[PDB]
Scaffold this active site. Structure first.
Site, mmCIF file in Angstrom:
data_model
loop_
_atom_site.group_PDB
_atom_site.id
_atom_site.type_symbol
_atom_site.label_atom_id
_atom_site.label_comp_id
_atom_site.label_asym_id
_atom_site.label_seq_id
_atom_site.Cartn_x
_atom_site.Cartn_y
_atom_site.Cartn_z
ATOM 1 N N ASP A 151 0.860 -1.185 0.000
ATOM 2 C CA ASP A 151 0.000 0.000 0.000
ATOM 3 C C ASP A 151 0.899 1.239 0.000
ATOM 4 O O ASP A 151 2.071 1.171 0.371
ATOM 5 C CB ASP A 151 -0.903 0.044 1.242
ATOM 6 C CG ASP A 151 -2.112 0.964 1.059
ATOM 7 O OD1 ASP A 151 -2.853 1.081 2.045
ATOM 8 O OD2 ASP A 151 -2.364 1.489 -0.083
ATOM 9 N N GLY A 152 0.351 2.355 -0.479
ATOM 10 C CA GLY A 152 1.038 3.645 -0.402
ATOM 11 C C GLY A 152 0.064 4.688 0.110
ATOM 12 O O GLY A 152 -1.146 4.493 0.078
ATOM 13 N N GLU A 175 2.044 3.866 -4.131
ATOM 14 C CA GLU A 175 1.439 2.551 -4.342
ATOM 15 C C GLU A 175 2.315 1.673 -5.254
ATOM 16 O O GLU A 175 2.478 0.465 -4.996
ATOM 17 C CB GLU A 175 0.007 2.737 -4.894
ATOM 18 C CG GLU A 175 -0.941 3.278 -3.813
ATOM 19 C CD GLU A 175 -2.384 3.475 -4.290
ATOM 20 O OE1 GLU A 175 -2.655 3.415 -5.511
ATOM 21 O OE2 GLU A 175 -3.264 3.642 -3.434
ATOM 22 N N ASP A 206 -4.789 -2.819 -2.619
ATOM 23 C CA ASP A 206 -6.020 -2.117 -2.960
ATOM 24 C C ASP A 206 -5.826 -1.046 -4.026
ATOM 25 O O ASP A 206 -6.763 -0.291 -4.305
ATOM 26 C CB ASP A 206 -6.655 -1.523 -1.691
ATOM 27 C CG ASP A 206 -5.923 -0.319 -1.169
ATOM 28 O OD1 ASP A 206 -4.847 0.030 -1.709
ATOM 29 O OD2 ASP A 206 -6.417 0.252 -0.170
ATOM 30 N N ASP A 257 -1.060 -0.324 5.143
ATOM 31 C CA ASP A 257 -1.587 1.034 5.205
ATOM 32 C C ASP A 257 -0.972 1.806 6.390
ATOM 33 O O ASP A 257 -0.553 2.981 6.260
ATOM 34 C CB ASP A 257 -3.132 0.965 5.290
ATOM 35 C CG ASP A 257 -3.752 2.336 5.583
ATOM 36 O OD1 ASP A 257 -3.549 3.265 4.781
ATOM 37 O OD2 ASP A 257 -4.369 2.515 6.663
#
Ligand SMILES: [Mg+2]
Ligand SMILES: [Mg+2]
EC number: 3.1.26.4
Length: 155
Positions: free
Chosen positions: A10-11, A48, A70, A134
């Site tokens: 995640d980013g 991301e 995601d 996250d």
């Protein structure tokens, strides 16, 4: 089978552009590696990508990877630039450089090492490891230490 690995990425970014960070978890045989770094001026989308690049680049043999994220941005380029239509010479319909090509090229190189199953997570409740990525990414964005040297206000 090859060495089986699970990757979660995640980013996050506090602005657009602004300080951002990435987080990734690589899991093999009950053992876990974590990756995170914070950048002073970047975007959510670049973070991301960086999360996926760094985790894949850490692998040291040909693996079967389940990569869970995601990021809709990551999905877009997988569909458009990094597998299909590389015949377009890294140009758009009007013959222009694609945005974030520095990262898309690093991702393309890293993906060619492995067999990849994508798990495109619907937001969250996908896995605790996505929630943990996250948190890693947001923690790094709050403590940036590097410049995103490939981010330009203009490419
Ligand atoms: Mg994000
Ligand atoms: Mg995030």
């Amino acid at each position: 089978m090859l060495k089986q690995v699970e990757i979660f990425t995640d980013g996050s970014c506090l602005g657009n552009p602004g300080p951002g960070g990435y987080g990734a978890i690589l899991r093999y045989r009950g053992r876990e590696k974590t990756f995170s770094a914070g950048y002073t001026r970047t975007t959510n989308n670049r973070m991301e990508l960086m999360a996926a690049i760094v985790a894949l680049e850490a692998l040291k043999e040909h693996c079967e990877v389940i990569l869970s994220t995601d990021s809709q941005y990551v999905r877009q380029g997988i569909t458009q630039w990094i597998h299909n239509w590389k015949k377009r010479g890294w140009k758009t319909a009007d013959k222009k450089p694609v945005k974030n090509v520095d990262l898309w090229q690093r991702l393309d190189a890293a993906l060619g090492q492995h067999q990849i199953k994508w798990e495109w997570v619907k937001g969250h409740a996908g896995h605790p490891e996505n929630e943990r990525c996250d948190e890693l990414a947001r923690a790094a964005a709050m403590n940036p230490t590097l410049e995103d040297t490939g981010y330009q206000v203009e490419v």
